Amino acid sequence: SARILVVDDIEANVRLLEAKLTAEYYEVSTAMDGPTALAMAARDLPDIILLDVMMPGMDGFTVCRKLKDDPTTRHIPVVLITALDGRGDRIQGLESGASDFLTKPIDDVMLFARVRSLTRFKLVIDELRQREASGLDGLGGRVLIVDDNERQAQRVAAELGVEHRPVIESDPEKAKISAGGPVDLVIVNAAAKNFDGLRFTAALRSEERTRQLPVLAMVDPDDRGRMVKALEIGVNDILSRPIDPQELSARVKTQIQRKRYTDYLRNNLDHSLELAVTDQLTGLHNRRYMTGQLDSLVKRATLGGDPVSALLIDIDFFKKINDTFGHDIGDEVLREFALRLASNVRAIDLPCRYGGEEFVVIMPDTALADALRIAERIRMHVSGSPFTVAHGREMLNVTISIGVSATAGEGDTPEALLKRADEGVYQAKASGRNAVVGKAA
Amino acid sequence: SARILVVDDIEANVRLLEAKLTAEYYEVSTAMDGPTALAMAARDLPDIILLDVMMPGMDGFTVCRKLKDDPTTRHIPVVLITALDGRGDRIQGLESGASDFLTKPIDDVMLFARVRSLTRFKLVIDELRQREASGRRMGVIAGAAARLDGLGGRVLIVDDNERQAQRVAAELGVEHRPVIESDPEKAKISAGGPVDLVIVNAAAKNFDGLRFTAALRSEERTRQLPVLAMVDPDDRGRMVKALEIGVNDILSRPIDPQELSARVKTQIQRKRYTDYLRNNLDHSLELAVTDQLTGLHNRRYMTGQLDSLVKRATLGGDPVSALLIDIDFFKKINDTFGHDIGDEVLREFALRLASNVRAIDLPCRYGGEEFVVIMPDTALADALRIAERIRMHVSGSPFTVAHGREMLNVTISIGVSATAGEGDTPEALLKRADEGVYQAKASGRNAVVGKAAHHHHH
Numbered sequence: 001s002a003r004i005l006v007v008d009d010i011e012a013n014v015r016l017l018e019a020k021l022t023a024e025y026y027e028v029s030t031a032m033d034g035p036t037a038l039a040m041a042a043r044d045l046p047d048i049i050l051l052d053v054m055m056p057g058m059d060g061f062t063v064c065r066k067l068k069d070d071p072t073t074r075h076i077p078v079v080l081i082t083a084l085d086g087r088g089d090r091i092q093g094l095e096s097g098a099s100d101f102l103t104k105p106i107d108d109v110m111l112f113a114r115v116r117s118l119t120r121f122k123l124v125i126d127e128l129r130q131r132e133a134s135g136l137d138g139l140g141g142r143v144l145i146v147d148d149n150e151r152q153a154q155r156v157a158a159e160l161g162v163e164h165r166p167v168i169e170s171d172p173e174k175a176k177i178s179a180g181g182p183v184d185l186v187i188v189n190a191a192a193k194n195f196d197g198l199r200f201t202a203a204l205r206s207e208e209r210t211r212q213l214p215v216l217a218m219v220d221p222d223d224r225g226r227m228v229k230a231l232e233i234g235v236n237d238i239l240s241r242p243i244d245p246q247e248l249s250a251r252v253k254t255q256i257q258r259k260r261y262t263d264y265l266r267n268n269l270d271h272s273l274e275l276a277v278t279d280q281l282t283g284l285h286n287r288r289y290m291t292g293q294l295d296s297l298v299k300r301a302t303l304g305g306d307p308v309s310a311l312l313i314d315i316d317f318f319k320k321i322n323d324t325f326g327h328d329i330g331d332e333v334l335r336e337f338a339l340r341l342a343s344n345v346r347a348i349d350l351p352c353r354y355g356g357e358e359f360v361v362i363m364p365d366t367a368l369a370d371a372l373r374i375a376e377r378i379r380m381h382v383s384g385s386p387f388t389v390a391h392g393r394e395m396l397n398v399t400i401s402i403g404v405s406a407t408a409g410e411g412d413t414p415e416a417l418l419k420r421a422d423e424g425v426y427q428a429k430a431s432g433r434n435a436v437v438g439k440a441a
Numbered sequence: 442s443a444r445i446l447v448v449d450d451i452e453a454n455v456r457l458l459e460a461k462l463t464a465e466y467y468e469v470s471t472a473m474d475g476p477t478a479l480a481m482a483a484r485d486l487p488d489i490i491l492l493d494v495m496m497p498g499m500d501g502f503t504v505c506r507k508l509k510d511d512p513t514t515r516h517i518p519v520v521l522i523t524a525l526d527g528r529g530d531r532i533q534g535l536e537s538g539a540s541d542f543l544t545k546p547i548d549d550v551m552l553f554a555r556v557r558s559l560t561r562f563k564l565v566i567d568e569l570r571q572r573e574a575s576g577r578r579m580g581v582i583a584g585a586a587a588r589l590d591g592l593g594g595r596v597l598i599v600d601d602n603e604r605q606a607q608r609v610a611a612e613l614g615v616e617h618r619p620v621i622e623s624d625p626e627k628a629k630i631s632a633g634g635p636v637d638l639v640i641v642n643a644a645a646k647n648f649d650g651l652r653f654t655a656a657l658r659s660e661e662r663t664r665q666l667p668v669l670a671m672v673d674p675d676d677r678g679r680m681v682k683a684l685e686i687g688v689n690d691i692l693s694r695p696i697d698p699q700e701l702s703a704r705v706k707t708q709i710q711r712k713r714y715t716d717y718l719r720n721n722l723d724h725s726l727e728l729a730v731t732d733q734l735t736g737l738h739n740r741r742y743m744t745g746q747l748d749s750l751v752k753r754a755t756l757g758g759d760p761v762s763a764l765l766i767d768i769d770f771f772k773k774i775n776d777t778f779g780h781d782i783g784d785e786v787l788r789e790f791a792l793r794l795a796s797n798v799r800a801i802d803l804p805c806r807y808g809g810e811e812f813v814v815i816m817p818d819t820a821l822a823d824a825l826r827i828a829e830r831i832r833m834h835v836s837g838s839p840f841t842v843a844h845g846r847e848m849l850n851v852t853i854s855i856g857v858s859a860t861a862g863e864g865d866t867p868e869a870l871l872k873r874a875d876e877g878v879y880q881a882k883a884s885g886r887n888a889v890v891g892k893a894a895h896h897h898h899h
């Protein structure tokens with residue numbers, strides 16, 4: 001279910017861990033030193049890396065620094081597994097970019113809960129990296145604090161305050177609202193006294209708008225069953241009470257960093273979508289592009305200047321087509337119709353794919369009368385000679401219903417102009433169909 | 442951590458189920474009949490629906506049909522939970538689109554394993570839906586997933602027991618294209634090709650069905666491939682394990698053929714649904730008519746439009762003007778600061794151009810360092826004025842570069858032209874602008890030069 005790379009200088013250690021992991025059905029690979037481990041990671045792209053710290057030559061903290069400083073491996077979660085228990089070493093570990101730091105001998109139940117947690121988050125990131133494939137820092141950023149322990153809430157807020165923008169909130173009902181705004185990370189108290197920390201977190205995950213929002217849980221270290229539960233409901237990371245400030249800073253950074261990379265992918269994918277100007281099926285311009293143009297045209301119209309007209313065209317009985325002859329022939333009806341349209345209207349006009357079975361034509365410098373004439377021309381055109389696709393199907397007979405509209409001086413808006421044409425379409429369909437109906441103020 | 446909608450006509454049943462579910466931290470909502478249930482689902486978009494079958498009025502099978510026939514709710518996995526145990530009813534349930542069919546009183550351990558399984562798949566499909574739905578709302582993506590089905594479909598049967606694989610392949614034969622494979626080592630290879638679904642024998646004798654499935658999930662190339670496990674029904678712990686390693690659906694031995702059909706249909710339709718989303722988000726990113734770097738229209742599109750505009754002009758009708766803009770010393774830039782910053786100069790310039798010109802105008806990337814603006818219904822005087830305006834904008838304030846850390850001065854030279862009588866052509870128009878540009882660069886640079894058409898004395 002995941003490819004895990006195990007690194008450790010004592011073979012007894014590697015063999016043991018390998019056994020436990022392959023017993024839960026992971027594909028395990030191994031390495032006995034730093035250089036080898038870097039090479040394997042670069043080459044094989046494991047889902048997770050489990051890493052000893054003390055080793056001859058290159059040690060785990062360097063290996064781990066190097067993993068994060070290379071763009072290829074940067075995304076791979078690292079877990080340090082080490083005989084070291086000192087706090088100094090723990091902090092050096094997390095500061096150097098590790099997702100967690102586990103002291104030998106490890107709790108198996110915990111390790112698995114944690115591996116499962118990391119693979120669950122890695123699903124969404126990996127699919128985004130694929131989508132981008134077809135075509136950053138952790139300081140600053142706003143951190144909401146949901147604790148009803150005033151004093152402990154204040155130290156967390158004090159510590160974060162130096163490099164971030166912390167905000168406290170004890171009322172959980174309000175914390176659901178604030179969570180919905182521009183928040184980068186939520187810190188929750190799992191051991192709260194006036195509400196259930198985990199339940200509140202579950203609520204955020206369940207809700208669509210906040211499901212990707214990172215959550216960091218403060219948990220009682222002597223309560224394993226509740227930590228496991230937290231990882232299972234969807235917590236990004238766990239902090240033990242009492243709260244180490246340095247550890248806290250390091251884990252917050254890490255999460256805000258990974259969060260920002262995932263928004264960076266989501267934002268690049270939206271940006272590219274925004275540049276795309278055509279409709280793929282039909283090769284006309286898309287709705288987005290038309291509305292952008294319609295906005296500038298209508299504005300210029302209202303400030304005195306060229307009136308603009310709009311035609312809204314809806315293909316009649318377009319389902320019966322798709323139902324009877326299948327969607328493949330439906331796509332052909334739309335493709336042909338698109339070409340008839342484009343070629344029966346001047347090049348300064350702007351024909352586009354508005355919706356599933358709807359098309360819009362924008363006619364600059366055109367008042368309502370000319371627009372009704374243009375529409376009637378187009379109508380007769382589709383109803384006048386059959387479609388090439390209906391040739392051998394004695395069942396097709398493609399007609400359209402058209403709604404026409406024109407700007408009405410200052411005060412008017414694109415939304416009102418398209419809504420007026422929708423009233424036209426509506427009226428054309430109630431008359432019988434295959435009809436043009438205009439609609440003034 | 443998931444929103445679950447529970448539907449049942451006996452309140453005792455709803456309360457109990459609600460309790461179990463809220464106790465494992467799901468957000469639970471409820472409904473006492475069909476109509477209400479349809480309404481809530483349409484409105485709240487639950488992650489999962491748990492559904493009684495026998496209810497006064499509209500029953501669960503109809504409710505479930507309607508859920509699948511509506512595009513809004515189509516994607517929600519439905520689990521039927523029912524006092525009915527008859528095989529007929531089970532098959533009618535799966536054929537109407539349900540993900541599973543559980544007979545009361547339900548095994549809780551199984552229910553939870555199953556809910557967790559569904560929420561885990563729904564993460565990737567949900568993210569792709571979310572990107573797509575954004576795309577449709579923003580006005581780029583169109584499409585109709587209603588054209589998706591689960592028939593046809595290449596089914597890879599990975600079984601050791603030859604006799605069972607043949608009975609399986611026998612039954613799939615009329616609606617699909619099945620292919621048997623007993624060597625697991627080879628089945629890993631075949632899995633990598635054009636396969637729509639893998640059927641594995643969990644109770645195999647010469648290899649570990651589950652292990653083999655884990656191997657597919659582990660490997661990046663096959664991780665989304667649907668897998669369907671044949672499992673011993675009297676072994677719950679191995680079913681749960683199966684769902685946990687990532688099996689899409691479970692079939693009990695001995696294999697009911699109709700159940701087999703129904704469930705295979707569902708899994709293929711699902712796989713196809715996912716591919717449809719991936720391919721929308723990909724195909725929409727392709728770039729027919731615009732320039733990739735700048736986002737302006739490309740030369741091909743411009744000339745097509747410039748032909749129709751100019752023709753209409755020559756037959757009496759609106760004059761058209763053209764601006765031809767050439768960035769000054771654009772090599773020295775590329776040479777000094779590298780082509781990466783050269784690309785940023787063009788990208789910024791493109792945005793200064795597009796925003797200082799009316800929407801009815803048509804700005805485009807003409808050549809390497811050249812741009813053209815087409816101005817319908819515009820004579821030469823107004824075009825010269827527009828040109829001068831644009832010039833002063835680029836020269837008037839410096840350009841940001843090197844990650845917003847360096848400032849750079851950029852001038853342009855512009856050539857201006859306008860249609861001129863019944864024998865004019867686009868070719869002639871652009872060549873008149875070329876002369877403009879050449880003259881502007883000779884004068885010094887950073888200048889606008891217009892050129893009118895001239896007939897000879899005779």
Ligand SMILES: Nc1nc2c(ncn2[C@@H]2O[C@@H]3COP(=O)(O)O[C@H]4[C@@H](O)[C@H](n5cnc6c(=O)[nH]c(N)nc65)O[C@@H]4COP(=O)(O)O[C@H]3[C@H]2O)c(=O)[nH]1
Binds near residue numbers: 301796797799800
């Ligand atoms: N009827 C009318 N509408 C007006 C007038 N002034 C502004 N608008 C409208 O408001 C938008 C913004 O004007 P801008 O800020 O000057 O930004 C303008 C301006 O920078 C430039 N531009 C367009 N036409 C002219 C012009 O005739 N003279 C000058 N100097 N600049 C123009 O292009 C930009 C965008 O033009 P648009 O896309 O059309 O979008 C224009 C236009 O729709 C006006 O006097 N009459």
Ligand SMILES: Nc1nc2c(ncn2[C@@H]2O[C@@H]3COP(=O)(O)O[C@H]4[C@@H](O)[C@H](n5cnc6c(=O)[nH]c(N)nc65)O[C@@H]4COP(=O)(O)O[C@H]3[C@H]2O)c(=O)[nH]1
Binds near residue numbers: 345348363364370374
């Ligand atoms: N943007 C835009 N406006 C349109 C369109 N169709 C008609 N109009 C407007 O409607 C007016 C009258 O069109 P008409 O009644 O067909 O009477 C038209 C038509 O009979 C003829 N005509 C002009 N261009 C063409 C053409 O390309 N093809 C044909 N067959 N006749 C044309 O000249 C007459 C007067 O032309 P105009 O003075 O331009 O005045 C035209 C024009 O302003 C169109 O597709 N796009």
Ligand SMILES: Nc1nc2c(ncn2[C@@H]2O[C@@H]3COP(=O)(O)O[C@H]4[C@@H](O)[C@H](n5cnc6c(=O)[nH]c(N)nc65)O[C@@H]4COP(=O)(O)O[C@H]3[C@H]2O)c(=O)[nH]1
Binds near residue numbers: 281357512585
């Ligand atoms: N997010 C999302 N929403 C969806 C999807 N499919 C349908 N819908 C929504 O449900 C409405 C009806 O879909 P339909 O039953 O397929 O009935 C549709 C369909 O039969 C047809 N249509 C729309 N797009 C296409 C297309 O690309 N090709 C063909 N052949 N037909 C299309 O026109 C009818 C009306 O389409 P719309 O006006 O778009 O109105 C659509 C749309 O808003 C989808 O895949 N994703």
Ligand SMILES: Nc1nc2c(ncn2[C@@H]2O[C@@H]3COP(=O)(O)O[C@H]4[C@@H](O)[C@H](n5cnc6c(=O)[nH]c(N)nc65)O[C@@H]4COP(=O)(O)O[C@H]3[C@H]2O)c(=O)[nH]1
Binds near residue numbers: 347753
């Ligand atoms: N009844 C009518 N139909 C109109 C009108 N305007 C546009 N159309 C229709 O839309 C088509 C495209 O016009 P175009 O793209 O500007 O490309 C046009 C245009 O550039 C030119 N053209 C044709 N007739 C005239 C005309 O009367 N005056 C002018 N100035 N140009 C014309 O030839 C091209 C093709 O003309 P068509 O073969 O007629 O094909 C015309 C015509 O079928 C109009 O005012 N009335």
Ligand SMILES: Nc1nc2c(ncn2[C@@H]2O[C@@H]3COP(=O)(O)O[C@H]4[C@@H](O)[C@H](n5cnc6c(=O)[nH]c(N)nc65)O[C@@H]4COP(=O)(O)O[C@H]3[C@H]2O)c(=O)[nH]1
Binds near residue numbers: 797798819823
């Ligand atoms: N297609 C196109 N044509 C352009 C453009 N810029 C100027 N023109 C043409 O040049 C004429 C006078 O432009 P002006 O010297 O800016 O003198 C303009 C200008 O001072 C002002 N104006 C109109 N719209 C705008 C605007 O959007 N922004 C600004 N800043 N001024 C505007 O009103 C005056 C009269 O404007 P018009 O009567 O429209 O007459 C305009 C128009 O036909 C352009 O970007 N695209």
Ligand code: BEF
Binds near residue numbers: 055081082083084104
């Ligand atoms: F050698 Be490891 F750091 F336990």
Ligand code: BEF
Binds near residue numbers: 495525545
């Ligand atoms: F009423 Be349900 F079908 F058990």
Ligand SMILES: [Mg+2]
Binds near residue numbers: 008010052
């Ligand atoms: Mg060691």
Ligand SMILES: [Mg+2]
Binds near residue numbers: 355356357358
């Ligand atoms: Mg539609």
Ligand SMILES: [Mg+2]
Binds near residue numbers: 449450493495
């Ligand atoms: Mg009942």
